[PDB]
């Protein structure tokens, strides 16, 4: 693996995990993100690191806090971000 050493998984649940599995299979470190209501979801324990994201936000709004996620991405050292499906998967502003 070349220029991605670490990746952020900008999603939750099944899909989040599948990505983590892929990374680990490729010796890529992984970073998870969880909303307040998802402190329990076992996708957050499946990563190499994890941070809360949508602070004070309504539960669905929490995984869409674009700006927050980038700060988290930048503070983590994440070379790249995988948005999975749903949420910010198709959001242009984030992609840009």
């Amino acid at each position: 693996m070349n220029r991605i050493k670490k990746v952020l998984v900008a999603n939750r649940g099944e899909i989040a995990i599948r990505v983590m599995r892929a990374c680990t299979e490729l010796k890529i470190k992984t970073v998870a993100i969880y909303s307040q209501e998802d402190t329990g979801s076992f996708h957050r324990y499946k990563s190499d690191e994890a941070y809360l994201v949508g602070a004070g936000k309504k539960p669905i709004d929490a995984y869409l806090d674009i700006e927050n996620i980038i700060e988290i991405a930048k503070e983590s050292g994440a070379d790249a971000i995988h948005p999975g499906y749903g949420f910010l998967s198709e959001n242009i502003e984030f992609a840009r």
Binding site: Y34, Y45, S47, D48, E49, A50
Partner: protein, 96 residues
């Protein structure tokens, strides 16, 4: 002595390490043995250093410029036969 210490210590000592050893030999090794076990504790906030952590508490520790450990203590394990018990943490969101 500088060689005595080097053999006593894991590696090659600095000039300062030496005088200290000469002045306080019993303690300097004891200090070394302790730093090997727990690492550079100088960094922990004082309350944590003397009082450890409360349950569900989260703290940050700066090991170096820009290198912060988010640490949360979730719960404490029950003792087993020989008194050992598992402590349950989240170092960087990742359960440990």
């Amino acid at each position: 002595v500088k060689a005595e210490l080097k053999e006593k210590m894991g590696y090659e000592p600095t000039e300062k390490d030496v005088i200290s050893y000469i002045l306080y030999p019993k303690v300097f090794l004891d200090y070394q043995e302790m730093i090997n076990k727990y690492g550079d504790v100088t960094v922990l906030d004082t309350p944590t250093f003397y009082k450890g952590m409360r349950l569900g508490e989260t703290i940050e520790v700066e090991l170096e410029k820009g290198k912060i450990l988010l640490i949360k203590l979730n719960s404490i394990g029950e003792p087993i036969a020989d008194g050992t018990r598992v402590i349950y943490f989240e170092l960087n969101g990742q359960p440990r």
